[PDB]
Design a binder for these strands. Structure first.
Length: 147
DNA sequence: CTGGAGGAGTTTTCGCCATGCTCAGACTGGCGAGTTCGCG
């Protein structure tokens, strides 16, 4: 509920529980070396970002999406980007999906603006038609169309 | 002949919620000008 949705109670990104996944005679996490404090750091950061109290998380389809910058109010409006369609690093975007007890990365972007017009823009421009009344609204919501 | 055990195979413990309406008309509008053949 308060973490990655649909995954096991405790999940991990790195794990080598089965022999088929080992190589060169290594074993366990030693199969990929990382300093202990470094491992702690990013895990804590990821846990923090997952906290619902901080408005930097959103669920789309099956994948949970997390983003961060020095400010987040505009990107947070992507909530309507699907719910009701219309110095610091800027807008890292990460989307991951859950396996049974381990996580996988779906996509990864670092672009600015946050534009998704590639599909939405095409989607809307395909729907263009002159209206009948003068008081109609240009951008109908999917709910209205389906109804 | 018996041991210790490294490896292969099976069982246990882990922790455990949520998303929200709507709503209305126009308009009235006039095409074009034409010519047929002819003996034994």
């Amino acid at each position: 509920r308060d973490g990655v949705r649909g995954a096991q109670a405790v999940a991990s990104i790195v794990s080598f529980n089965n022999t088929a996944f080992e190589s060169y005679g290594k074993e366990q996490s030693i199969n990929a070396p990382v300093s202990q404090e470094a491992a702690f750091s990013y895990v804590t950061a990821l846990n923090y970002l997952l906290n619902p109290s901080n408005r930097q998380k959103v669920t789309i389809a099956d994948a949970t999406v997390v983003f961060w910058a020095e400010r987040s109010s505009p990107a947070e409006d992507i909530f309507a980007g699907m719910f009701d369609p219309p110095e610091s690093v800027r807008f890292h975007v990460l989307g991951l999906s859950p396996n049974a007890a381990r996580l996988s990365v779906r996509f990864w972007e670092v672009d600015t603006v946050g534009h998704m017009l590639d599909k939405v823009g095409r989607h809307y421009r395909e729907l263009e038609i002159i209206p009948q009344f003068n008081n109609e609204q240009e951008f109908p919501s999917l709910s209205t169309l389906l109804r």
